Amino acid sequence: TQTCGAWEMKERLGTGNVIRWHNQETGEQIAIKQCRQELSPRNRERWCLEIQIMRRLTHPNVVAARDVPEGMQNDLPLLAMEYCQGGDLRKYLNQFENCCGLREGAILTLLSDIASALRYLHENRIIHRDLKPENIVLQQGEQRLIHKIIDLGYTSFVGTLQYLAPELLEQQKYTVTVDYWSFGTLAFECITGFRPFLPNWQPVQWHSKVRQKSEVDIVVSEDLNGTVKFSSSLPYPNNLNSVLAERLEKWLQLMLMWHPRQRGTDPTYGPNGCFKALDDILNLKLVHILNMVTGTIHTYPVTEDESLQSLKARIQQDTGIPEEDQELLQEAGLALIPDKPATQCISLNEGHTLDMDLVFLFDNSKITYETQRPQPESVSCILQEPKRNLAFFQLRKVWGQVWHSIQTLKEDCNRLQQGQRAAMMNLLRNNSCLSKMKNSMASMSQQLKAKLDFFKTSIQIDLEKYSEQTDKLLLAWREMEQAVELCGRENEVKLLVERMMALQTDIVDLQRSGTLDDLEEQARELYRRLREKPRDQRTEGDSQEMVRLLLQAIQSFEKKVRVIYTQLSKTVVCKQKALELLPKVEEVVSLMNEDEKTVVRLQEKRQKELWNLLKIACS
Amino acid sequence: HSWSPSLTTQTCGAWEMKERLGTGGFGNVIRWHNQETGEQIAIKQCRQELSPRNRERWCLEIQIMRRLTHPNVVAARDVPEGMQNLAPNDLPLLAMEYCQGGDLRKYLNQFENCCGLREGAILTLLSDIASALRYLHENRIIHRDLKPENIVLQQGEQRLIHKIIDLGYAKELSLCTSFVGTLQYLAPELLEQQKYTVTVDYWSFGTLAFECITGFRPFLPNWQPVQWHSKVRQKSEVDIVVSEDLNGTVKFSSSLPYPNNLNSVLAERLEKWLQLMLMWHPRQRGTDPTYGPNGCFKALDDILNLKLVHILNMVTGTIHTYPVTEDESLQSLKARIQQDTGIPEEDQELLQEAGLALIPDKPATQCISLNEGHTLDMDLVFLFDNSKITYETQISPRPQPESVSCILQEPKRNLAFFQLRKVWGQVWHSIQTLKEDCNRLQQGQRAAMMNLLRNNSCLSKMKNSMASMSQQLKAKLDFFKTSIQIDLEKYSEQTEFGITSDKLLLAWREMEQAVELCGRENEVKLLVERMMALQTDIVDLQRSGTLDDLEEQARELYRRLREKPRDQRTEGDSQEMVRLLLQAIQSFEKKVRVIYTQLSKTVVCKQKALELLPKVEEVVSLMNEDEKTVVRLQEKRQKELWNLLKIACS
Ligand SMILES: COC(=O)[C@@]1(O)C[C@H]2O[C@]1(C)n1c3ccccc3c3c4c(c5c6ccccc6n2c5c31)C(=O)NC4
Ligand SMILES: COC(=O)[C@@]1(O)C[C@H]2O[C@]1(C)n1c3ccccc3c3c4c(c5c6ccccc6n2c5c31)C(=O)NC4
């Protein structure tokens, strides 16, 4: 469609226009901003000034300027930039599985990358003014997706106002705190899936309502009825952990602050201390413990110095399980190493979650495990009245939330299976040593039976041929014979082989044996269809089909969870029996070893006593 | 003058009148049920006003019925007291037993019997009806209206018993003249209006028998008499079928048509017996080359008394049927299998359902395990070639009938409803056969798996014995090595002052180097590795649909066609049906590929097992000698030492 030697023109990246160019020879990719339009002298200057700013700036989180390919013939120059393979953040936010916000890993890398870029811009005295998901592009790094800032210019109308700091509608002059507002609204949208303050509301009405919020309010929303509610708390559903939700909630209060001068001011780090505040949150080292007793995830911020014993004492307060009874296991069934620090649980990209470095907690005191999430306000609201007609935009929100609820049921249920598999892995690892010991015991018993048989044969000859050639020796030898009768732990080994054999049966029955996975795929496809519905077909309707799926998923979940706990309590009773048998086997192998030592000595002594007879006779 | 809401049909004491058992006419045979005992009866009544000839004809029937007594002939029962009052005239009623299985026409009409009845059902029919006709003819009675409507099924203690009914056309004998019977089973002679004999009942039995084997009558069904007579007259002595093809050509054949549910031998032997019965010549009909005139019953007796053995060659996927004698040895059968499969006696691995190898010196009849549910699958033996390392994943499915392969080639062809009904039933039957054939192959793979697991069991039992013997030997050797080292040390220590026996020292030193060579620890070690690696492959083998659904789909499609109203019965393609068969053929060969992949995996394991068994046996032997020698050498040394003490004590 257009070429420049090896440089061939590709698809439009967005709208003058931005188009991708690919080098046929090197495989190199570039983005070119072009204007075929005729501009006013001020906007002409504005265009040139941007190319100049870009050429000056150099940062890992700011799109790099590139040379315009030689021979790339309005009169205004082109803006050649690096091509970011990941695409814009709006595209990511629009992925159907991100309707209720992005994953935890994706949020931490966003926050980090955009805070670092904003810091560079502001220190080089560049104020963005139009920061939004459309102005954030993702580049493919070596191990993760890197967020970069674009458009450093120097629904439709209501659309443009969506990330603007309130002062911008009110006055002319502004400060860096305009970019805090934008970063905060943006960040919130990535956590929750929607903007903090009454999205798509008309400016006059928006301004009048949001003005009324308190210093601690980070969300102003309209329910289905349509009550406007203000909140200090980060909304649910979100894919963040307990601690991160709590800590990002308070950081957002700094950023979504109505007061323009007070915005970004940290109580510790003073004005513009919002970047140092986030640094603390991002540098936190978190440990996630799943209490198998209750099924709740406990998150603990740990220090590099913090010992496993300190963490155990902290788990103790939230679970009621004493340090001594705490069995802490990981994915593969290994118990946590006490010499090592609490940070041992920690194993950083967009695919990072709490599930990655998750530890499963079991109570050694428990013999049996009895089975023990609250859906958002809008979901429980539609559960009560599923036949209610909702406008398409309202349908889109509750359906995404219902789908998210089911995904959570599925994910929650799989974490419990992972916990049961960790306990099974530990059991199989113990059963392995138990088998290795059983075989040694079996082998030692057979070797002992053999040596005893041989000694019994040997001594019988020696007793016969002695009496034939006619004291203290005869009585001593007869004691040797009755003494070796008492050793041999055949009957004790017998019983332990029965137990060890009966145990391995229960274990093979445990390892030798969904709809909840299916109900999620059903809900996902139903939500997919709603969002892929043509604009003319977007009308009013019921949530009957969706609410049907959630109820079936709840029912399926509790049924599936019952079975997980039945197998867990079966696994733990096997683990007990195993731990009970190990010393019993060890003890019998010890006894047998002494029996062998005794047979060996008694044989050596008798032989030496016979050569002694031959001495006396040789004189 | 008022309408009653009661629904009691008509009573006679404890006896409640139920439905008519017949199909058309006034309702001559009706079922009666005893409310108190639960007993059921059938009552035949004559027509109200009769001509003196038909009055005489009626009496003659009552007389014949009263005389007759046979397990396969419905006997005359006492008329319940008070019923003769409710009779149309002075003439008696015919009270008979009620046969709960119903008539044979009902069975022939069951949609799953469109291509004939099952092999078990054919053998019990033939046996029961031959015995009844034999009884009649020996007691000089000719039936003259034998057909499926005149055969009823009674519930026996272990099977369904076929019985003969309706002696209303029957004559006591001699030659007869009367134009009596059913057009569809009417012997040529009766249409020629000639004098005739018992051979009229042979024709009826033969046409009937054929219809039960194939699903349709032998000679041009539903053709008008004049046209029928003109065409069927032209058949040869050996022809048992005259039919109309898809292109309407009338074809004559000596052979029994396909599809049928009979085995190879039974089809061949019943084919030639049918030539005797469907013989145009009236005097020659039923004449057997061995048993002479009227020897057709003794001929069938031979066929029925045959003891058959069904062998499934797993290499090809074909079933070989062998008529065996009570004296016939397994070796004779093996020699017979050899000719049809090319597998020598020594390479023949013959297994049954549960994976047990056939016992030589037991007779060939050991393979044989008898009602309507009896099949060749019951007493089936699976043949494997010990020479084979791998089995070919393709085996060629069964050759489908002439009409099926004809419509497979051109499915868009329009056929008349009656032609559609035939090919669709046949296509449905082809799919059922694909399903059945495929399951037999799985059974063969499971028999080989069962044999493997049985062998692996003994192999495990031997491994443990070997392991145990090895540990016991290691122990005794350790002890002997310790013992002899003491004895050698304390001897050399006492040479100068004590006893010097150069002969003893050398003998004892030989004992010591001799026991160094024995102990088979490293040999046992390797066998435990192999035995362990084998058991892995075996657990991987044992720890590892659309063909049945495609059949249900075809069954429903054929069902729909048959239940189609008479006005709606028009022309059509077999596109929907041919689609299903192609899918079934594709599904079958896919399923069969998997069966053979696992079979060749099973047989390689079975080889390794049979390779390991002697190796284990050999090492345990060696170890046993090592033990024997240790025990002896120890005893001898001890006795030699006490001998030194004798010499020193003198
Ligand atoms: C409608 O799209 C937009 O608003 C974008 O800001 C977002 C979108 O196009 C715009 C115009 N955009 C811009 C608007 C203004 C300046 C630069 C860009 C821009 C760039 C890139 C991309 C891009 C790459 C892959 C998918 C989408 C992409 N976009 C851009 C860039 C890029 O890779 N390098 C520069
Ligand atoms: C055209 O012929 C028929 O329909 C039958 O032969 C076949 C039919 O009714 C008839 C009239 N029939 C007869 C015609 C003539 C004599 C006896 C029967 C007869 C009998 C029975 C039955 C019977 C039982 C169950 C279903 C249908 C049954 N039928 C009969 C009997 C029976 O149980 N005992 C005798």
Q: Within 10 A of B106 (CB to CB), how many other CB atoms are there?
A: 14
3-state secondary structure of A266: strand
Chain A residues inside the 8 Å CB shell of B645: 469, 610, 613-614, 617
Q: Which one of A75, A130, A151, A223 is the catalytic residue?
A: A130
CB spacing of A603 vs B641 below 8 angstroms: no
d(CA A129, CA A178): 6
d(CA B617, CA B620): 5
Q: Running DSSP on this structure, what letter comes out for residue A172? A: S
Residue listed under structure tokens 């603390």: A280
Per DSSP, the residues of A343-388 read GGG----TT--TTTTEEEEEETT-SS-----PPPHHHHHHHH-TT-
d(CA A447, CA B529): 21
CB A185 within 8 A of CB A256: yes
Do A217 and A308 fall into the same domain?
A: no
Task: Give the minimum alpha-carbon distance from A555 to chain B in angstroms, rounded to a whole number.
Answer: 29
Q: At how many Å resolution was this determined?
A: 2.8
A526-540 burial, b for 16+ CB within 10 Å, e for fewer? bbeebeeeeeeeeee
CB A72 within 8 A of CB A7: yes
CB A446 within 8 A of CB B468: yes
Give residue A134's identity as a one-letter amino acid code: E
- Residue A524's domain comprises 368-619
β-pairing verdict for B94-97 and B40-44: antiparallel
β-pairing verdict for A285-291 and A358-363: parallel
Cβ partners under 8 Å of residue B146, min gap 6: B133, B164, B185, B201, B204, B205, B208
Task: Out of B283, B305, B327, pick the residue that ends a domain.
Answer: B305
d(CA B220, CA B241): 8
d(CA A272, CA A265): 5
Cβ partners under 8 Å of residue B172, min gap 6: B60, B64, B140, B141
Give residue B510's identity as a one-letter amino acid code: E
Do A96 and A22 fall into the same domain?
A: yes
Do B421 and B524 fall into the same domain?
A: yes
d(CA B558, CA B575): 13
3-state secondary structure of B50: coil
Q: Running DSSP on this structure, what letter comes out for residue B430? A: H
Cβ partners under 8 Å of residue B564, min gap 6: B417
Do B370 and B404 fall into the same domain?
A: no
Ligand 2 centroid vs B48 CA: distance in angstroms?
A: 20
Cβ partners under 8 Å of residue B403, min gap 6: B245, B246, B422, B423, B426
- CATH of residue B526's domain is 1.20.1270.250
* Residue A22 exposure: Cα atoms within 13 Å on the Cβ side: 9
What is the position in ligand 1's atom list of the atom closest to the CA of A14?
9
d(CA B435, CA B437): 6
3-state secondary structure of B415: strand
CB A603 within 8 A of CB B479: yes
Ligand 1 centroid vs A146 CA: distance in angstroms?
A: 15
3-state secondary structure of A276: helix
CB A198 within 8 A of CB A221: yes
Residue B461 burial (C-beta neighbours within 10 Å; 0-12, 13-18, 19+): exposed
Give CA A399 to chain center in angstroms: 25
Chain B residues inside the 8 Å CB shell of A600: 479, 482
Do B380 and B403 fall into the same domain?
A: no
Residue listed under structure tokens 């991708």: A20
Per DSSP, what are the bridge partners of residue B222? none
d(CA B182, CA B530): 75
Structure-token pair, residue A160? 């443009």
3-state secondary structure of B354: coil
Residue listed under structure tokens 């019985």: B163
Give residue A362's identity as a one-letter amino acid code: F
Do A96 and A148 fall into the same domain?
A: yes
* Ligand 1 pocket test, candidate residues A13, A47, A55, most atoms within 8 A of CB: A13
Per DSSP, the residues of A100-131 read T--BHHHHHHHHHHHHHHHHHHHHTT---S--
d(CA B641, CA B638): 5
Interface residue of B465, B481, B486, B628 to substitute, partner A, most A CBs within 10 Å: B486
Do A385 and A350 fall into the same domain?
A: no
Helix extents (H) in B255-318: 264-277, 296-304
Nearest CA to ligand 1 atom 2: A14
H/E segment holding residue A176: none
d(CA B360, CA B328): 12
3-state secondary structure of B320: strand
Nearest CA to ligand 2 atom 34: B98
H/E segment holding residue A147: strand A145-149
CB A544 within 8 A of CB A581: no
Task: Out of B305, B327, B347, pick the residue that ends a domain.
Answer: B305
H/E segment holding residue A496: helix A490-511
Structure-token pair, residue A181? 């507002």
- CATH of residue A258's domain is 1.10.510.10
Structure-token pair, residue A394? 């309202």
Residue A191 burial (C-beta neighbours within 10 Å; 0-12, 13-18, 19+): buried
3-state secondary structure of A20: strand
Do B348 and B274 fall into the same domain?
A: no
Give CA A567 to chain center in angstroms: 24
Using alpha carbons, select from A487, A491, A504, A489 the residue that is nearest to residue A581. Answer: A504
Do B233 and B103 fall into the same domain?
A: yes
Angle between helices A392-468 and A544-617 (to 10 degrees): 10
B249-274 burial, b for 16+ CB within 10 Å, e for fewer? eeebbeebbbbbbbbebbbebbbebb
Using alpha carbons, select from B545, B541, B352 the residue that is nearest to residue B439. Answer: B545
CB A207 within 8 A of CB A220: no
CB B260 within 8 A of CB B116: yes
Cβ partners under 8 Å of residue A577, min gap 6: A499, A503
CB A151 within 8 A of CB A130: yes
Cβ partners under 8 Å of residue A424, min gap 6: A333, A510, A511, A571
- Over the Cα atoms of chain A, what is R_g? 37
| Annotation marks residue A536 as catalytic | no
After which residues, if any, is chain A broken (C to N > 2.5 Å)? 15, 73, 154, 347, 372, 470, 513
* Residue B510 exposure: Cα atoms within 13 Å on the Cβ side: 10
Cα→Cα distances A252→A219, A255, A257, B648, Å: 10, 5, 8, 107
Residues in chain B whose beta carbon is closer than 8 A to a beta carbon of chain A?
468, 471-476, 478-480, 482-483, 486-487, 490-491, 494, 497-499, 631, 634-635, 638-639, 641-642, 644-646, 648-649
Do B411 and B513 fall into the same domain?
A: yes
Task: Out of B391, B408, B441, pick the residue that ends a domain.
Answer: B391
Structure-token pair, residue B629? 């020698």
d(CA B30, CA B12): 14
Residue listed under structure tokens 């950081």: A251
Long-range contacts from A564-568, C-beta under 8 angstroms, 24+ separation:
A564/A413, A564/A416, A564/A417, A564/A420, A565/A369, A565/A370, A565/A371, A565/A416, A567/A420, A567/A510, A568/A292, A568/A369, A568/A419, A568/A420, A568/A423
Give residue A255's identity as a one-letter amino acid code: M
d(CA B348, CA B601): 19
Q: How many domains does chain B have?
A: 3
Per DSSP, what are the bridge partners of residue B322? B309
Q: Which of B635, B638, B648 lies nearest to residue A614, judging by beta carbons?
A: B648
- CATH of residue A342's domain is 3.10.20.90
d(CA A374, CA A385): 18
Per DSSP, the residues of B211-271 read HHHHSS-SB-TT--HHHHHHHHTT--TT--EEEE-TT--EEEESSPPSS-B--HHHHHHHH
Do B288 and B320 fall into the same domain?
A: no
d(CA B172, CA B42): 24
d(CA A64, CA A51): 11
Task: Give the minimum alpha-carbon distance from A449 to chain B in angstroms, rounded to a whole number.
Answer: 7
Give residue B421's identity as a one-letter amino acid code: R
3-state secondary structure of B285: coil
H/E segment holding residue A9: strand A7-14
What is the position in ligand 1's atom list of the atom closest to the CA of A82?
34
Structure-token pair, residue A30? 């570039």
* Residue B579 exposure: Cα atoms within 13 Å on the Cβ side: 9
Using alpha carbons, select from A149, A119, A136, A124 the residue that is nearest to residue A275. Answer: A119
Ligand 2 centroid vs B94 CA: distance in angstroms?
A: 12
Residue A549 burial (C-beta neighbours within 10 Å; 0-12, 13-18, 19+): buried
* Residue B153 exposure: Cα atoms within 13 Å on the Cβ side: 17
CB spacing of B472 vs A449 below 8 angstroms: yes
Structure-token pair, residue A440? 């040694």
Q: Within 10 A of B637 (CB to CB), how many other CB atoms are there?
A: 19
Do B287 and B432 fall into the same domain?
A: no
- Over the Cα atoms of chain B, what is R_g? 38
Ligand 2 centroid vs B43 CA: distance in angstroms?
A: 9
